[PDB]
Design an enzyme around this catalytic site. Sequence first.
Site, mmCIF file in Angstrom:
data_model
loop_
_atom_site.group_PDB
_atom_site.id
_atom_site.type_symbol
_atom_site.label_atom_id
_atom_site.label_comp_id
_atom_site.label_asym_id
_atom_site.label_seq_id
_atom_site.Cartn_x
_atom_site.Cartn_y
_atom_site.Cartn_z
ATOM 1 N N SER A 163 17.074 6.873 15.541
ATOM 2 C CA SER A 163 16.695 6.645 14.189
ATOM 3 C C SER A 163 17.932 6.818 13.354
ATOM 4 C CB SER A 163 15.558 7.646 13.846
ATOM 5 O OG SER A 163 15.262 7.503 12.407
ATOM 6 N N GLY A 164 18.153 5.877 12.472
ATOM 7 C CA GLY A 164 19.350 5.988 11.641
ATOM 8 C C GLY A 164 20.612 5.393 12.246
ATOM 9 N N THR A 174 17.855 -1.858 12.545
ATOM 10 C CA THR A 174 17.226 -2.697 11.592
ATOM 11 C C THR A 174 18.276 -3.468 10.816
ATOM 12 O OG1 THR A 174 15.234 -1.301 11.484
ATOM 13 C CG2 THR A 174 15.707 -2.754 9.560
ATOM 14 N N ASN A 211 16.574 9.112 8.260
ATOM 15 C CA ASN A 211 16.908 7.828 7.663
ATOM 16 C C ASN A 211 16.045 7.613 6.465
ATOM 17 O OD1 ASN A 211 17.208 5.009 7.237
ATOM 18 N ND2 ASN A 211 16.695 4.453 9.429
ATOM 19 N N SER A 237 13.573 4.540 7.364
ATOM 20 C CA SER A 237 13.169 4.547 8.775
ATOM 21 C C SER A 237 12.038 3.567 9.103
ATOM 22 C CB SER A 237 12.701 5.932 9.155
ATOM 23 O OG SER A 237 12.563 6.067 10.562
ATOM 24 N N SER A 238 12.186 2.787 10.197
ATOM 25 C CA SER A 238 11.157 1.869 10.643
ATOM 26 C C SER A 238 10.159 2.719 11.397
ATOM 27 C CB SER A 238 11.803 1.012 11.754
ATOM 28 O OG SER A 238 12.949 0.202 11.253
ATOM 29 N N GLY A 290 15.512 3.840 21.007
ATOM 30 C CA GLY A 290 15.897 4.052 22.371
ATOM 31 C C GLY A 290 15.049 5.313 22.771
ATOM 32 N N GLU A 334 13.527 8.889 22.995
ATOM 33 C CA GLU A 334 13.302 9.898 21.989
ATOM 34 C C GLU A 334 13.139 11.260 22.643
ATOM 35 O OE1 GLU A 334 9.776 8.763 19.542
ATOM 36 O OE2 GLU A 334 11.248 7.585 18.504
HETATM 37 C C1 LIG Z 1 17.377 -1.690 2.440
HETATM 38 N N1 LIG Z 1 18.170 -0.626 2.998
HETATM 39 C C2 LIG Z 1 17.837 0.684 2.824
HETATM 40 C C3 LIG Z 1 16.758 0.898 1.889
HETATM 41 C C4 LIG Z 1 16.410 2.158 1.357
HETATM 42 C C5 LIG Z 1 17.249 3.286 1.664
HETATM 43 C C6 LIG Z 1 18.352 3.131 2.552
HETATM 44 C C7 LIG Z 1 18.607 1.863 3.204
HETATM 45 C C8 LIG Z 1 19.012 1.638 4.665
HETATM 46 O O1 LIG Z 1 19.271 0.499 4.986
HETATM 47 O O2 LIG Z 1 19.831 2.588 5.280
HETATM 48 C C9 LIG Z 1 20.670 2.323 6.402
HETATM 49 C C10 LIG Z 1 21.743 1.575 6.239
HETATM 50 C C11 LIG Z 1 22.896 2.270 6.907
HETATM 51 N N2 LIG Z 1 23.574 1.382 7.887
HETATM 52 C C12 LIG Z 1 23.282 0.996 9.189
HETATM 53 N N3 LIG Z 1 24.189 0.110 9.770
HETATM 54 C C13 LIG Z 1 25.105 -0.019 8.735
HETATM 55 C C14 LIG Z 1 26.023 -1.064 8.462
HETATM 56 N N4 LIG Z 1 26.794 -1.709 9.319
HETATM 57 N N5 LIG Z 1 26.784 -0.875 7.343
HETATM 58 C C15 LIG Z 1 26.416 0.121 6.449
HETATM 59 N N6 LIG Z 1 25.351 0.926 6.422
HETATM 60 C C16 LIG Z 1 24.735 0.778 7.616
HETATM 61 O O3 LIG Z 1 22.285 3.265 7.729
HETATM 62 C C17 LIG Z 1 20.924 3.431 7.417
HETATM 63 C C18 LIG Z 1 20.173 3.412 8.737
HETATM 64 O O4 LIG Z 1 20.294 2.106 9.350
HETATM 65 P P1 LIG Z 1 18.956 1.460 9.992
HETATM 66 O O5 LIG Z 1 19.408 0.126 10.478
HETATM 67 O O6 LIG Z 1 17.789 1.509 9.080
HETATM 68 O O7 LIG Z 1 18.668 2.445 11.158
HETATM 69 P P2 LIG Z 1 17.650 2.269 12.485
HETATM 70 O O8 LIG Z 1 18.361 2.330 13.771
HETATM 71 O O9 LIG Z 1 16.741 3.550 12.359
HETATM 72 O O10 LIG Z 1 16.789 1.055 12.229
HETATM 73 F F1 BEF Z 2 14.921 4.052 14.047
HETATM 74 BE BE1 BEF Z 2 15.159 3.801 12.553
HETATM 75 F F2 BEF Z 2 14.719 5.009 11.666
HETATM 76 F F3 BEF Z 2 14.354 2.568 12.086
HETATM 77 MG MG LIG Z 3 14.843 0.679 11.823
#
Ligand SMILES: CNc1ccccc1C(=O)O[C@H]1C[C@H](n2cnc3c(N)ncnc32)O[C@@H]1COP(=O)(O)OP(=O)(O)O
Ligand code: BEF
Ligand SMILES: [Mg+2]
Length: 743
Positions: free
Chosen positions: A180-181, A185, A229, A232-233, A453, A455
Amino acid sequence: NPIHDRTSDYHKYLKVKQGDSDLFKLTVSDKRYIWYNPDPKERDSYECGEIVSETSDSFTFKTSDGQDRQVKKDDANQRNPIKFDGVEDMSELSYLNEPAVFHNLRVRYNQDLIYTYSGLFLVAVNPFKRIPIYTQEMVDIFKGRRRNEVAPHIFAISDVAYRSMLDDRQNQSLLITGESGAGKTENTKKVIQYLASVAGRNQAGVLEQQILQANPILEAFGNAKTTRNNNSSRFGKFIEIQFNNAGFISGASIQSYLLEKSRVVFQSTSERNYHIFYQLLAGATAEEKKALHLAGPESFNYLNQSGCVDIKGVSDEDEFKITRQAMDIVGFSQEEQMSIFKIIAGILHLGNIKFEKGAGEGAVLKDKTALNAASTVFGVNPSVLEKALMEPRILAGRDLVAQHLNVEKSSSSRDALVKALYGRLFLWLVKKINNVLCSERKAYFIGVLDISGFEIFKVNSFEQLCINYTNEKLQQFFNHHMFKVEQEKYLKEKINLDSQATIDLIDGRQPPGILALLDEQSVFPNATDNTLITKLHSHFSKKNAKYEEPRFSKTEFGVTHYAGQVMYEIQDWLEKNKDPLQQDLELCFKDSSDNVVTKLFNDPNIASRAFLTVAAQYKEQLASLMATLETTNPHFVRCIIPNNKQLPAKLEDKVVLDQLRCNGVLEGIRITRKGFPNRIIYADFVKRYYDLAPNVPRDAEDSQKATDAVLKHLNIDPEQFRFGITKIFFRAGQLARIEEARE
Ligand SMILES: CNc1ccccc1C(=O)O[C@H]1C[C@H](n2cnc3c(N)ncnc32)O[C@@H]1COP(=O)(O)OP(=O)(O)O
Ligand code: BEF
Ligand SMILES: [Mg+2]
């Protein structure tokens, strides 16, 4: 060509900066280093120690303090020559040990190079800051470029998939996993953006726009701020981008999994409920509020518990707009939008119901405002609802008698009602969108899987087992894939388990695995967490090698997973497996006057599972997913979180390495390093090493001959290298030594 333009943002942000000269000579140095743990109190914290001498069997080095230690040559983590620092593919490293691998990643991350290949994987480290590499201009440069032709990027892997799809006429897949984070996404969104651009129907795109607009809808409803995050999804997804024979996007489909319905009724401190709750309450017109009996989040039980109601640098009201905007594009009728919002409201209303006792033991509703409010918005009959909640009719065989539930039971029921409503709406939303985007007649597809991945949390429950089960499957698919791909490579040049047991422990039918036993306890109304855990230990404690019964805990059990042992707690598994909802409540809602509500209880495709249990459906859905994958040419992206604080410029060795261990990156390398890790194109070899042999010139025609010349010159150990039809295969450390050779 920003690719050739050393002044472009392309060079600035995606490449290691290149100076004037390339000359082997610069990088010259006498020192020979090793990576060592400045103490085993740690293990992931390493330091570079210069080898000050060595024996026929080991090395002696100096520490940072100047302390002289010794190590077995056979236990040494040799440091790769400086020239290798910053390589775009870890497959290029000579010494392929843990600290070495971390080091390359870190050198890269220190220059804000967040993407790095590792053989078949694309490693992606979250920068936790903006890097302007996702512009249209950046899109443009990756078009039609080979992996080896451009810097590592998610766009790159996306282009390779798109090309392969068109060239091989084979469906593709991109599996984007990690914690997560980690950035899954975000990276998923980039793949789609990329595809939308390279393959969209230009001119200005309507379908494309709808495809893009579906995410936002889904994120509002399935994403939430957690401690790891802000966005978070809380569901997994598999998106299929559909293309016609011409390579133009023809449609898309979305599969969602494991939505965290429980978050609707409860959130940990600092966390938030799903985004939409805040969006509605912030973005609703003072007029819609009135019509919805809406107040502030502080006025709602389901939103006033965590202590957090806002996200830093996030405008709920501004987001609401975006949300409504997207629904419009996709094609949600105002009427439907109304009802979705009504459902959202209603749920908030259900949460504000306060069951009381006294009278006896059964619950009473002194106040019915909340009730009235939910009933209205939902379009159901309050009295019916009321009774369905506290006095559900239950089947005692032949007898169908109403029961007077106490407060807690009444409360739980209400909670179950809310979770069912939310999960069903979410499902409905998905189907609605698929209806719009989905094409029964697609030629090809590129599917993106954005899912966690493995948990391994403080507390691991049923949902954790599910996800880890999926993960064992994907890891095994990777391993199988790596196997063929490596074999094929060796074959084209003219060269040289365990997942099952774990998978079987969980999903086996005979002997039965964990899920089969769970399902079995599921038919017994009176079964308990204790009966369940006793059965599990009965069949597997000291009997199945991947299983472990704890020394003292009576409620947990351990599974040896690919990523290591995970301890699961069995509480409420029985309930989770059934996901029960009282019939009366179903009956109540089925009569809803709301157009959308009716669907949620009346459409069996939505209202129900088949009934099969939650575990059985999970297993089935995972099997279909894998089936699909099996039919594709896959690409793997491993997203890595640099630390646990959501900070840029803070790459923690321990945080990182642990991820590399669990995600298959290091294993992959271990394996690789066992054979002939370095594989170099003849001309490329000679180009750099020609001057090491009194004989050869930089650009020679007989590059293979030329290669053998240097090797021969150098007098390298034959079994250390392998002549391939077009590349020189080198065993681990060979190239580094050669690198270490005088001009
Ligand atoms: C619409 N976006 C959001 C909305 C509300 C609050 C935070 C965010 C969110 O996206 O927050 C993001 C964005 C930032 N992030 C990830 N990859 C990068 C990238 N290459 N460059 C910069 N930052 C990155 O890290 C946070 C977590 O990424 P994520 O893709 O949501 O994580 P996960 O693996 O859980 O899906
Ligand atoms: F796994 Be991330 F919080 F979508
Ligand atoms: Mg996500």
